Amino acid sequence: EDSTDFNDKILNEPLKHSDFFNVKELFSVRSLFDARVLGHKAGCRHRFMEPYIFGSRLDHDIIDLEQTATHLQLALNFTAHMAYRKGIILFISRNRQFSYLIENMARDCGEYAHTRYFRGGMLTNARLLFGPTVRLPDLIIFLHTLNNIFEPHVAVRDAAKMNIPTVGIVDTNCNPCLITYPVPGNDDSPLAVHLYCRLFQTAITRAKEKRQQVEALYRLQGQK
Amino acid sequence: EDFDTRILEVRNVFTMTAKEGRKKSIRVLVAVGNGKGAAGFSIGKATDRMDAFRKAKNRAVHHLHYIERYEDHTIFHDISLRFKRTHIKMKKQPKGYGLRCHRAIITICRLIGIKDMYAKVSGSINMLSLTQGLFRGLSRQETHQQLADKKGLHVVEIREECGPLPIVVASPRGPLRKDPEPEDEVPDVKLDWEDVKTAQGMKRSVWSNLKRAAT
Amino acid sequence: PRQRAIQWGEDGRPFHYLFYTGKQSYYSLMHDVYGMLLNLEKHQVIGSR
Amino acid sequence: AFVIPKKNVPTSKR
Amino acid sequence: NVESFASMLRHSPLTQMGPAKDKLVIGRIFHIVENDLYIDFGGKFHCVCRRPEVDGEKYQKGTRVRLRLLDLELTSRFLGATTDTTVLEANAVLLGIQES
Amino acid sequence: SNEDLPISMENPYKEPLKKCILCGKH
Amino acid sequence: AGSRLETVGSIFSRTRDLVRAGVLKEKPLWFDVYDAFPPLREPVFQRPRVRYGKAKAPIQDIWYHEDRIRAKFYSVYGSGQRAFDLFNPNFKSTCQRFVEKYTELQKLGETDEEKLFVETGKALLAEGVILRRVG
Ligand code: FES
Ligand SMILES: [Mg+2]
């Protein structure tokens, strides 16, 4: 009798608002431009990234930041709703310049990071690797979708096998076909990677605090 | 407990090893289906036949397709496909027609829940290709609703047993177009000679339409 | 033999941010040493085997 | 249904 | 009156630079591995330059230095490849230290 | 509409084609 | 149960269908969020294929009217002595100053590029800019 009311007031309520967590304010097109959110040379272009490329400036693909903004809005919204729902978020990246930064960001927001060599079967053979009662991640955010031989990170395919939604920064040489919420943007410049980490860390932190505030209000009201 | 498993092929494949020479392995194709559209298949390999059966059965359930059944008894439209060298031409049939198709397709159809269908398999009769091709076609069949939404038009079913009554099977959930689909005088469609040859009573086969047990 | 404790609670959330690596202890140590080196860089035998 | 002989309690039983 | 992305691109410093070949720019040493100096000049990728022998001591993390850009990204396609090989690095010549 | 959108031109920075030392000499 | 056929449809299409069939007893946590705020493109696996024959990419080269001025300036004078500071978003180079003066003199109504280019250089020389020609 009480569970349905609890679920409606808490779990279903946020899903009725377009921007419940107000992630719009976290970024603007100007802020993305100032972080060099600049693609690879035209010869490195992936065919599936052409819809997101504004053009080539002297053989350097320029990502259209007007699409990035709409894609990032959806990605940050989805991430917040999953953090609000107490979902396990796993950050995956094989760029070794940013492994330390990404591992700190995960620990700071109370989530998980996998910046190391991805061993075969981490997701599709987890019950054997971790244990029969292990819980897999509910969301996987790829800050870099390519491995260190410029090929798609194996976890992208494996996440889809396990029906785990994926958020991913997809540069002009990346394949976004299996990434659920692709965000076209530069994944090389530190300024860009530092912005993504700030944006996803803030959205997760905000969502978790909102869950505590909403639960607290529901409980205080329930008693009286 | 809802899903049922049925073997499709058991093969004694061999490799050569330096120490022992011929090393016998078992390759097993199985199909699992609950009878309500969810069905899959897998290949299991093991030295012992029991281990091969288990591996295939347990792995098939993690690779389940969902098959769209029209009125939960047949396919939505006729599907013609080629998977590698195997040609499968399936025809939609009315209720009470039965499963007039290759024994393996009959088995898979019972697992999917299709009761009425006709299918002719041509080219190579490889069991692996047939199964993989059958699931490829049935998965890609477009439902009447998907057609209405894509075309923005009503899908009207004309049944001979119901005379001229127009039965609307699907309507466009979004806005309904006001322009009629252009009626091409002559359709530039590729016809299968075997279909045309039968419609003209030019196909004599002593093996066609033979009386068979209920399937 | 020394056995490692359960790494996740009842909710199922693991207790370590590097759990999904499979080597949380090893990689946590590597992370710590790398951090110390970074800070040291920004700030700047016979018996022992 | 052909019953695959079912595995017993894992023999290794670590 | 919101600035469009196209407006930002047209007036971006990188656009007005145009071809990067033989363009003198100012970088910042953000990371140092032995002699190897990793310099950021505002492009997509950094440029790696060996510590000049004349005044190596001066080059420290954060020091601003003058570069002559040669290429923004070192890429090339070799026999049989479907896509360019990329070093993920810029080609530049370290001229000296910027002094105001 | 907007005047800042890129226009279609032939590469203005394109360098002239190289010539062999004997180009134009009998 | 789940379906590991990552190449057949999307995670939502597969998940939705299995929940409808009753294979999945409970829909996953993300299902409700996905449906409420779906992505612009459904994530369906598609194979990249090489362009053959006359097929070409639609990506167009980014050019501007002032690139003609910049090319001429760089040829006549070369790279300015002032080093480009790309960190400052408002940084103006000597070439950019030339473009601006060139454009300002275009508004005056000069119709000859060569004359207009000469007039542009003279105005900069008067303002104290150092314009050392390659010659
Ligand atoms: S380049 Fe040799 S004849 Fe002109
Ligand atoms: Mg990149």
PDB file of C-alpha atoms and ligand atoms in Angstrom, chain F residues 18-20 23, ligand 1:
ATOM      1  CA  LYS F  18      56.317  22.982 -58.277  1.00  0.00           C
ATOM      2  CA  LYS F  19      58.366  23.110 -61.476  1.00  0.00           C
ATOM      3  CA  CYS F  20      61.411  21.164 -62.602  1.00  0.00           C
ATOM      4  CA  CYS F  23      60.486  23.499 -67.129  1.00  0.00           C
TER       5      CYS F  23
HETATM    6  S1  FES H   1      57.566  20.616 -64.442  1.00  0.00           S
HETATM    7 FE1  FES H   1      58.985  19.769 -65.898  1.00  0.00          FE
HETATM    8  S2  FES H   1      58.285  20.563 -67.830  1.00  0.00           S
HETATM    9 FE2  FES H   1      57.208  21.735 -66.305  1.00  0.00          FE
END
